[PDB]
Amino acid sequence: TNAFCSQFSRGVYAIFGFYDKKSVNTITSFCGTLHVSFITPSFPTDGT
Amino acid sequence: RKQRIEISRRGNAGDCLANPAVPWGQGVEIERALKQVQVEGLSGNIKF
Incomplete structure (x- = not known):
């Protein structure tokens, strides 16, 4: 955060970065809220 | 209060995202209190 x-x-x-299973929801929520784009090599989020 | 420790240094305005973050020490003494208190509720014996 x-x-x-x-x-x-x-x-x-x-923003290009890595995330964890503990940190995934923070990133997804904040990027979906502030409409900033996020690029990651890490595992794919569950759902849409 | 039975232990007569001071609960709060300041009443308002603390910032959460401060870098580096300043943890207020008295907070720890709160954590302990909540952890060490035992009471009878709707659940049964409430102890942590």
Whole structure:
């Protein structure tokens, strides 16, 4: 969350990063809310 | 309160995303309290 918000304040157009099964919902929720795009090599989210 | 420890340094304005994050120490003493208290509720013997 901290890193993400720092990036947002920095004014990034997109964010590439890794996530965990503990961290997946944070990323999905915040990216679905702030409409910032997220690129990940990690496992695919369950559902849409 | 029976232990007469001070519960709060400041009443309002704390920031959650501060980098690096400042944990208020008194919070720990809260955690302990909640953990060490035992009472009779609708569930049965309530002990943690």
